[PDB]
Structure formats: structure tokens, C-alpha cells
Design a protein around this ligand. Structure first.
Ligand SMILES: [Mg+2]
Length: 245
RNA sequence: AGAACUGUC
RNA sequence: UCAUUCAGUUCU
């Protein structure tokens, strides 16, 4: 047995921080790590070459446009921003209608997934996971978004639909590939899992966390909703004026 | 009031 | 650039 690294999906929830311009954090490797299951020292350099290849294309990604295209602020946002710019010893009902408009602005699972897929396809090279495996990875992203609170994914359900032979940059020490490949699959699946974790944990999740406030409603059960960071800043700021209530 | 830059869960 | 909270600086 091999226990794959955990996908941390609890990170996407309840992030209040707005960072001005989009494109994740300053703490992320994207702005200014772990090698284990790799064979020899050569694979580690090949992985490091993809990572620096990855961060460069990331800066070429325009998050302002990709958001606009996919996950879009409401057309009344300016009016919503204006109405919260008011109220700051009255305001009782009108705020209730103002909260109903802000929470109305949730972003659909398909929207979020199309956004994520667009980020990954631009950010992550197709040669990293291999052509067919990269396609399997992108398809599985909708389930990741759609899934409720406390619902998670396992790397086990990723790799099992993939092929380790689709990865061309994996290296073969002293040729075990065609001799015993039950072993080769066993060793390389450990690396492929680390790559899947890498994309999801260090890219997909921090993108979602940073740009969106993800939570669940009391009335909606464990089902989760994606709110735009600016929208939630309005909500958060409209809750603060309720300090009196 | 318009505009520009920078740090950042 | 649909947006740009918080903090800090600057040009009319
Ligand atoms: Mg200021």
C-alpha cells in the first residue's frame, strides 16, 4: 500500500482576505520545495524545471479578464457598492434587502470549474502529467468544486484513471520499465500522486481561497457557495455596521 | 474629486 | 482591468 498525500479542501473555505490584484498570495511560490518519491537526482531537476516553467506562465495569466469572462461581479455591483457606502442610526429593513442582493451574487459550480480549468491549462504544461492524464485531471475538477462541505477527493480516484506511461519525463534507472513494470507502475504512481497534490494544493486551492469567499448557508445544508472576494467585502462590511443592530 | 505606485492572512 | 478590502506613499 501507498498512502497518497492528502488533498486539503478545508482551505478553500472562509477566507476573508482581499489582496487587491488577483492571482493568489504573496506567500505563494508564484511570487519570489518538497522532493521525496523521486528516483535518483535527475527527476528532481526535471520537476524543478516544470515549476519555474509554471510560475512564469502564471504571471502571463490575466486574472482580471479571466474572472470577468467566467466568474463575474453582478452588473449592479457599483450600485451595491454605493448602497453599502451609504449606511456608514437607521437602515433596519433596507439592509435585509441589501444582504439578499449580495448573497444573490453567488458563482455557479460550472463557472468556477471553467475558471479553474482555464487557469490550469494556461499555468500548467501538458507534459507534466502527460497529455491524457492532464485531461483526466481537468475533468475531475468539477467534482472538486461541486462537492459539499466535509466532502473531499482522494488522489486514489485520480491516478486510477491515469497512465504512468503517459508521462514522458519520468526516468528509468538501469531499465526496470519493460522488465518488471508492476514495480515501475508502483514507483512512478507515488510521484504522479505528488504531482496531482502539487497542482491541487499549491495552485487550484490557493486560487480559489484567495479570489473567492467559499462558505455554506444555514438553510442550504452542507452545500457550498462561491462568493467573489469583493462581494464578500461588502457583506463583511455590512455585518460590521450591525454591531449595534 | 479624478489619477499613479507599493505592502499584504 | 468585472474588481482593487486593509495599510502606506505620490501626482493635480
Ligand atoms: Mg488609502
Amino acid at each position: 500500500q501507498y498512502i497518497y498525500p492528502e488533498i486539503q479542501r478545508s482551505q478553500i473555505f472562509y477566507c476573508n482576505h482581499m489582496g487587491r490584484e488577483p492571482g493568489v498570495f504573496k506567500s505563494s511560490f508564484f511570487n519570489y520545495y518538497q522532493s521525496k518519491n523521486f528516483s535518483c537526482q535527475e527527476e528532481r531537476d526535471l520537476f524543478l524545471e516544470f515549476t519555474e516553467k509554471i510560475v512564469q506562465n502564471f504571471h502571463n495569466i490575466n486574472f482580471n479578464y479571466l474572472l470577468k469572462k467566467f466568474c463575474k461581479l453582478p452588473e449592479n455591483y457599483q450600485s451595491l457598492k454605493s448602497q453599502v457606502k451609504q449606511i456608514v442610526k437607521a437602515n433596519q429593513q433596507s439592509c435585509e434587502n441589501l444582504f439578499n442582493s449580495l448573497y444573490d451574487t453567488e458563482i455557479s459550480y460550472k463557472q468556477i470549474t471553467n475558471f479553474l480549468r482555464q487557469i490550469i491549462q494556461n499555468c500548467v504544461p501538458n507534459q507534466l502529467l502527460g497529455k491524457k492524464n492532464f485531461k483526466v485531471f481537468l475533468e475531475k475538477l468539477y467534482e472538486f468544486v461541486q462537492m459539499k462541505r466535509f466532502e473531499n477527493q482522494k488522489v486514489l480516484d485520480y491516478i486510477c484513471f491515469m497512465d504512468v506511461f503517459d508521462v514522458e519525463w519520468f526516468v528509468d534507472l538501469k531499465n526496470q520499465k519493460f522488465t518488471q513494470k508492476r514495480k515501475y507502475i508502483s514507483d512512478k504512481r507515488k510521484i504522479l500522486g505528488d504531482l496531482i497534490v502539487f497542482i491541487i494544493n499549491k495552485i487550484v486551492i490557493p486560487v480559489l481561497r484567495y479570489n473567492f469567499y467559499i462558505t455554506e448557508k444555514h438553510k442550504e445544508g452542507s452545500q457550498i457557495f462561491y462568493y467573489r472576494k469583493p462581494i464578500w467585502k461588502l457583506v463583511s462590511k455590512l455585518t460590521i455596521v450591525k454591531l449595534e443592530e
